[PDB]
Write an enzyme that holds these catalytic residues in place. Structure first.
Site, PDB file in Angstrom:
ATOM      1  N   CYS A 108      -0.251  15.885  24.697  1.00 39.18           N
ATOM      2  CA  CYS A 108      -1.340  16.469  25.460  1.00 39.18           C
ATOM      3  C   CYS A 108      -2.583  15.586  25.449  1.00 39.18           C
ATOM      4  CB  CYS A 108      -1.702  17.856  24.926  1.00 39.18           C
ATOM      5  SG  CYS A 108      -2.897  18.697  25.975  1.00 39.18           S
ATOM      6  N   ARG A 111      -6.521  17.867  24.565  1.00 38.20           N
ATOM      7  CA  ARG A 111      -6.836  18.565  23.315  1.00 38.20           C
ATOM      8  C   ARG A 111      -8.301  18.511  22.885  1.00 38.20           C
ATOM      9  NH1 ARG A 111      -2.787  15.630  19.338  1.00 38.20           N
ATOM     10  NH2 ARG A 111      -2.383  13.982  20.872  1.00 38.20           N
ATOM     11  N   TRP A 280      -5.591  23.573  32.860  1.00 38.63           N
ATOM     12  CA  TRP A 280      -5.839  23.165  34.240  1.00 38.63           C
ATOM     13  C   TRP A 280      -5.195  21.814  34.431  1.00 38.63           C
ATOM     14  CZ3 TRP A 280     -10.131  24.680  31.183  1.00 38.63           C
ATOM     15  CH2 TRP A 280     -10.688  23.638  30.429  1.00 38.63           C
ATOM     16  N   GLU A 285      -0.920  14.487  37.668  1.00 32.71           N
ATOM     17  CA  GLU A 285       0.263  15.343  37.550  1.00 32.71           C
ATOM     18  C   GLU A 285       0.762  15.800  38.911  1.00 32.71           C
ATOM     19  OE1 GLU A 285       0.473  18.098  34.111  1.00 32.71           O
ATOM     20  OE2 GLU A 285      -1.723  17.909  34.179  1.00 32.71           O
TER      21      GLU A 285
HETATM   22  C1  HEM Z   1      -7.238  22.518  29.485  1.00 28.23           C
HETATM   23  C2  HEM Z   1      -6.730  21.553  30.266  1.00 28.23           C
HETATM   24  C3  HEM Z   1      -5.472  20.712  29.920  1.00 28.23           C
HETATM   25  C4  HEM Z   1      -5.171  19.526  30.463  1.00 28.23           C
HETATM   26  C5  HEM Z   1      -6.002  18.748  31.497  1.00 28.23           C
HETATM   27  C6  HEM Z   1      -3.931  19.064  29.899  1.00 28.23           C
HETATM   28  C7  HEM Z   1      -3.295  17.892  30.201  1.00 28.23           C
HETATM   29  C8  HEM Z   1      -1.985  17.619  29.874  1.00 28.23           C
HETATM   30  C9  HEM Z   1      -1.180  16.552  30.418  1.00 28.23           C
HETATM   31  C10 HEM Z   1      -1.660  15.536  31.478  1.00 28.23           C
HETATM   32  C11 HEM Z   1       0.025  16.610  29.832  1.00 28.23           C
HETATM   33  C12 HEM Z   1       1.241  15.691  30.107  1.00 28.23           C
HETATM   34  C13 HEM Z   1       2.305  16.600  30.728  1.00 28.23           C
HETATM   35  C14 HEM Z   1       3.143  15.923  31.779  1.00 28.23           C
HETATM   36  O1  HEM Z   1       2.817  14.781  32.181  1.00 28.23           O
HETATM   37  O2  HEM Z   1       4.146  16.531  32.226  1.00 28.23           O
HETATM   38  C15 HEM Z   1       0.018  17.730  28.905  1.00 28.23           C
HETATM   39  C16 HEM Z   1       1.061  18.124  28.108  1.00 28.23           C
HETATM   40  C17 HEM Z   1       1.050  19.103  27.146  1.00 28.23           C
HETATM   41  N1  HEM Z   1       0.009  19.971  26.898  1.00 28.23           N
HETATM   42 FE1  HEM Z   1      -1.852  19.817  27.764  1.00 28.23          FE
HETATM   43  N2  HEM Z   1      -3.479  20.014  29.005  1.00 28.23           N
HETATM   44  C18 HEM Z   1      -4.404  21.057  28.991  1.00 28.23           C
HETATM   45  C19 HEM Z   1      -4.315  22.222  28.231  1.00 28.23           C
HETATM   46  C20 HEM Z   1      -3.330  22.545  27.322  1.00 28.23           C
HETATM   47  C21 HEM Z   1      -3.167  23.807  26.639  1.00 28.23           C
HETATM   48  C22 HEM Z   1      -4.100  25.018  26.863  1.00 28.23           C
HETATM   49  C23 HEM Z   1      -2.091  23.701  25.841  1.00 28.23           C
HETATM   50  C24 HEM Z   1      -1.452  24.723  24.873  1.00 28.23           C
HETATM   51  C25 HEM Z   1      -2.061  25.859  24.531  1.00 28.23           C
HETATM   52  C26 HEM Z   1      -1.565  22.369  25.993  1.00 28.23           C
HETATM   53  C27 HEM Z   1      -0.474  21.854  25.352  1.00 28.23           C
HETATM   54  C28 HEM Z   1       0.328  20.851  25.858  1.00 28.23           C
HETATM   55  C29 HEM Z   1       1.642  20.552  25.369  1.00 28.23           C
HETATM   56  C30 HEM Z   1       2.381  21.278  24.235  1.00 28.23           C
HETATM   57  C31 HEM Z   1       2.133  19.387  26.221  1.00 28.23           C
HETATM   58  C32 HEM Z   1       3.510  18.690  26.133  1.00 28.23           C
HETATM   59  C33 HEM Z   1       4.224  19.097  27.424  1.00 28.23           C
HETATM   60  C34 HEM Z   1       5.712  19.009  27.311  1.00 28.23           C
HETATM   61  O3  HEM Z   1       6.223  18.260  26.434  1.00 28.23           O
HETATM   62  O4  HEM Z   1       6.382  19.705  28.107  1.00 28.23           O
HETATM   63  N3  HEM Z   1      -2.333  21.688  26.903  1.00 28.23           N
HETATM   64  N4  HEM Z   1      -1.227  18.318  28.951  1.00 28.23           N
HETATM   65  C1  LIG Z   2      12.274  17.538  32.873  1.00 27.94           C
HETATM   66  C2  LIG Z   2      11.261  17.731  31.763  1.00 27.94           C
HETATM   67  C3  LIG Z   2       9.921  17.730  32.109  1.00 27.94           C
HETATM   68  C4  LIG Z   2       8.936  17.907  31.139  1.00 27.94           C
HETATM   69  C5  LIG Z   2       7.490  17.910  31.619  1.00 27.94           C
HETATM   70  C6  LIG Z   2       6.460  18.155  30.523  1.00 27.94           C
HETATM   71  N1  LIG Z   2       5.767  19.460  30.645  1.00 27.94           N
HETATM   72  C7  LIG Z   2       4.795  19.495  31.752  1.00 27.94           C
HETATM   73  C8  LIG Z   2       3.461  20.118  31.349  1.00 27.94           C
HETATM   74  C9  LIG Z   2       3.355  21.035  30.306  1.00 27.94           C
HETATM   75  C10 LIG Z   2       2.133  21.625  29.959  1.00 27.94           C
HETATM   76  C11 LIG Z   2       0.976  21.279  30.642  1.00 27.94           C
HETATM   77  C12 LIG Z   2      -0.257  21.833  30.323  1.00 27.94           C
HETATM   78  C13 LIG Z   2      -0.399  22.831  29.212  1.00 27.94           C
HETATM   79  C14 LIG Z   2      -1.389  21.453  31.039  1.00 27.94           C
HETATM   80  C15 LIG Z   2      -1.272  20.524  32.067  1.00 27.94           C
HETATM   81  N2  LIG Z   2      -2.360  20.131  32.779  1.00 27.94           N
HETATM   82  N3  LIG Z   2      -0.062  20.002  32.357  1.00 27.94           N
HETATM   83  C16 LIG Z   2       1.056  20.348  31.673  1.00 27.94           C
HETATM   84  C17 LIG Z   2       2.288  19.784  32.028  1.00 27.94           C
HETATM   85  C18 LIG Z   2       9.307  18.078  29.801  1.00 27.94           C
HETATM   86  C19 LIG Z   2      10.653  18.075  29.463  1.00 27.94           C
HETATM   87  C20 LIG Z   2      11.630  17.907  30.456  1.00 27.94           C
HETATM   88  C21 LIG Z   2      12.879  17.901  30.139  1.00 27.94           C
HETATM   89  N4  LIG Z   2      14.031  17.861  29.977  1.00 27.94           N
END
Ligand code: HEM
Ligand SMILES: Cc1cc(CCNCc2ccc3c(C)cc(N)nc3c2)ccc1C#N
Ligand code: HEM
Ligand SMILES: Cc1cc(CCNCc2ccc3c(C)cc(N)nc3c2)ccc1C#N
Ligand SMILES: C[C@H](O)[C@H](O)[C@H]1CNc2nc(N)[nH]c(=O)c2N1
Ligand SMILES: C[C@H](O)[C@H](O)[C@H]1CNc2nc(N)[nH]c(=O)c2N1
Ligand SMILES: [Zn+2]
EC number: 1.14.13.39
Lengths: 404, 405
Positions: A108, A111, A280, A285
């Site tokens: 993330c 954070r 958000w 993305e």
């Molecule tokens: C508040 C605005 C937030 C922004 C701009 C943001 C941004 C991002 C971005 C750019 C990613 C990469 C995901 C991707 O490329 O698919 C991500 C992943 C992630 N975010 Fe954030 N995030 C936000 C809030 C949060 C919140 C509220 C949580 C949890 C309560 C969180 C937890 C995570 C986790 C656990 C991932 C890993 C995603 C995955 O492996 O599927 N984020 N976030």
């Molecule tokens: C196909 C795939 C895709 C992903 C994508 C990762 N999760 C996307 C994600 C998860 C959480 C977000 C949050 C919390 C905020 C944000 N702005 N973007 C977020 C984007 C992860 C695992 C797999 C698998 N397998």
């Protein structure tokens, strides 16, 4: 030893010592490095030791370690686990765990926000139907007429010898992808499987490019029921380009709420198998991945054509050019629609401060460099030039198998 | 399934297993509890024999004569040599084999589709700093080939027991000077400041342009490095200009045609070639994005951006993105105009996917550093972004070594 961490634009050096408290193994070993892999390859006092830790965290969190508010709670957990082979979290321990999970999540880039999290306790949930209402209220709180808000909702913990509560969808809001017999796909190709699962459970499918899917919600050991989001709830933004007037006429749109519903929240040994969370968007993305990924809506070439570029060869950088205009149209639209969103430049700048905050608070910050660096303009952002250490801290959000 | 790493491409959904990493005999930076894959530089006749034997085995296997009588005789030959003189020496074709292997084994190189086409110049006879210079001049002429660039490496004598190493002090054969200003700023290339002042300390008469080619600092065994100035017509440069922005040309930006690394150690069969410069040709983004837009290099992004009439006071104008694209475009356009070999980051990563596909069949995998294989712009717009990779050290290797001073 303890890893040296260097920023190559600034010349500065840190030392991650927070990693020393990593209790679970990542994918790597000395012989091979598997850091680029998206998913991982794979008694009772192991639980009890996982739960001791988390409690120590929580009381250290609220300054009062080693009191007896602390050590009594320690004995509660021990007693509960000793008699039931599991235990239960007090709501405020849960709010803490949920915030620690986000804080600890290496992937993330958002954070900086980690403290500002709305936790809805939804463990008093006994049916798919109750699940739906909980979700409906999550979205309205979180969408917040476009002034978006980070929110998690937490459904009942998993239980030995009982099914799990699951949300079958990967995100609360996603677009249908209908496979065409003609090889192609209309809609989002990332959602074909779940789209058909919906159809399979009697959803009346549309034939649009941006049809909002219904929710398959599943109470333990029962068939998933199907729920259709009140169209009022799903806030969408139409895309349009602030100078290219043909862009709006591309029919492109994206929903405003990024809410992930298929991950597992782990706190203190306890596993919560349905705990959707949301924030958000970062512009890349939507504008780079969801729209330009070759295995997604894949619109680079279309835009390129309307931009009258040289598709004929790669060294004209037609792809690059097209991409930038899309990312701009996504920031334009969201800003014009007054829906919260952040550009990749703003986001990584704030993540750099977060790094610094983290370094001073805990001695480090687990980060996955490949995910923290945006999909365009890599080296144009400060996080590119920043070395990162990656490791699994608990509490933690985790991947888990799909319920079918 | 298989006990080996499973590797997936998320664009195509395809799956592979890396079996080649089972032969990675040297450990890298990561452990189960910590990944350090983002770090640029993580830190006896006994031991020699092992490496020696292993390499000779690789060799005879590459020429399908494994376990033959020539094979077991080579191994005795080397054992004998190591036994008396503490070291041993490579045959010409062994050397060639090892040099190509070290290239093939290089995880951060996206150009490895070409690894089999590499001119190896043997300079293991070279006996002075003067001769080093001549070999190096020869390399540059051959490699440059009037802009029809050809990959090459030149191999000067190996480390010898109790004898000073051959060293080229400069990081590359061609580098622009970095001059620390009276202000605090740097004129030219901030990367090259330390070597620049070392040239001067060793007697160079420094100019003061943004683009002043440095002299070579060439060190033969147990001798102070001597200064050598490159004949300007040997050093091909490219005047950067933009295909549609006529003002771009006015910025007076140039870059040199030949990327030639001169400070890496080349290791084969446990033998250390402390001085073995090698060259290929540039990928567009190396120049256009890193060298010209890095905050800590020439840093011209804001400048181009202001000329483009962009809103450089908001991140969300993506003014940085708009200018980065046009600078890369100008690089590509200019090298193409000058008939100088250049490969855009798109066509490069596409070639690397083919290399991956090839290496899968040939060896059972390809060691690859994802963060160095994915371009510094347009990342996910290239196939390699969506490709999982496995990183491990195989030998022969190109390694890093400390600066000789
Ligand atoms: C508040 C605005 C937030 C922004 C701009 C943001 C941004 C991002 C971005 C750019 C990613 C990469 C995901 C991707 O490329 O698919 C991500 C992943 C992630 N975010 Fe954030 N995030 C936000 C809030 C949060 C919140 C509220 C949580 C949890 C309560 C969180 C937890 C995570 C986790 C656990 C991932 C890993 C995603 C995955 O492996 O599927 N984020 N976030
Ligand atoms: C196909 C795939 C895709 C992903 C994508 C990762 N999760 C996307 C994600 C998860 C959480 C977000 C949050 C919390 C905020 C944000 N702005 N973007 C977020 C984007 C992860 C695992 C797999 C698998 N397998
Ligand atoms: C032929 C065209 C070639 C291209 C397009 C190419 C491209 C690249 C690029 C873009 C990098 C990244 C370096 C950086 O950003 O700092 C790289 C690294 C590297 N290349 Fe290649 N290369 C080529 C030829 C060669 C040759 C001939 C060799 C060796 C004989 C080689 C060995 C290496 C090594 C060892 C690295 C790692 C750099 C380091 O670790 O410091 N390359 N290459
Ligand atoms: C300062 C520094 C710089 C680098 C740069 C890596 N070497 C650049 C290089 C090396 C060889 C190349 C070759 C052979 C071809 C090509 N197109 N580009 C090449 C680029 C690596 C580590 C450090 C450090 N510390
Ligand atoms: C194979 C590669 O590791 C994979 O596609 C990763 C790369 N980096 C990423 N970074 C982000 N933010 N999101 C992603 O989905 C990915 N995908
Ligand atoms: C900190 C980070 O690892 C560093 O900036 C790396 C990132 N990837 C890179 N990739 C290439 N090709 N060359 C580099 O110098 C770097 N630098
Ligand atoms: Zn690793």
């Amino acid at each position: 030893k303890f890893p040296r961490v260097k920023n190559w634009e600034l010349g500065s050096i840190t030392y991650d010592t927070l990693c020393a408290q990593s209790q679970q193994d990542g994918p790597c070993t000395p012989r091979r490095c598997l850091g680029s892999l998206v998913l991982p390859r794979k008694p009772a006092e192991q639980l009890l030791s996982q739960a001791r830790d988390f409690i120590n965290q929580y009381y250290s969190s609220i300054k009062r370690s080693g009191s007896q508010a602390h050590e009594e709670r320690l004995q509660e957990v021990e007693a509960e686990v000793a008699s039931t082979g599991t235990y239960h979290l007090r709501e405020s321990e849960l709010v803490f765990g949920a915030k620690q999970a986000w804080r600890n999540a290496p992937r993330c880039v958002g954070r900086i926000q980690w403290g500002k999290l709305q936790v809805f306790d939804a463990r008093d949930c006994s049916s798919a139907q109750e699940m739906f209402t909980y979700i409906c209220n999550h979205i309205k709180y979180a969408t917040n007429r476009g002034n978006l808000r980070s929110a998690i909702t937490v459904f009942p913990q998993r239980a030995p010898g009982r099914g799990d509560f699951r949300i079958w969808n990967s995100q609360l809001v996603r677009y249908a992808g209908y496979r065409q017999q003609d090889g192609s796909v209309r809609g989002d190709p990332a959602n074909v499987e779940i789209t058909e699962l919906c159809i399979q459970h009697g959803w009346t499918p549309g034939n649009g490019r941006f049809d909002v899917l219904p929710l398959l919600l599943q109470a333990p050991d029962e068939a998933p029921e199907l729920f259709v989001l009140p169209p009022e709830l799903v806030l969408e933004v139409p895309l349009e380009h602030p100078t290219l007037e043909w862009f709006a006429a591309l029919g492109l749109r994206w929903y405003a709420l990024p809410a992930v519903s298929n991950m597992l929240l782990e706190i203190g040994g306890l596993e919560f198998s349905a705990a959707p969370f949301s924030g958000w968007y970062m512009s890349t993305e939507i504008g780079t991945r969801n729209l330009c990924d070759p295995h997604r809506y894949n619109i680079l070439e279309d835009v390129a054509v309307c931009m009258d570029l040289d598709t004929r060869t790669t060294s004209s950088l037609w792809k690059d050019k097209a991409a930038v205009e899309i990312n701009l149209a996504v920031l334009h639209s969201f800003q014009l629609a007054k829906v919260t969103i952040v550009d990749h430049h703003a986001a990584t700048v704030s993540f750099m401060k977060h790094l610094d905050n983290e370094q001073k608070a805990r001695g480090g910050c687990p980060a996955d460099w490949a995910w923290i660096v945006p999909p365009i303009s890599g080296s144009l952002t400060p996080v590119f030039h920043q070395e990162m250490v990656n490791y699994i801290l608990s509490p933690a959000f985790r991947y888990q198998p799909d319920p079918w």
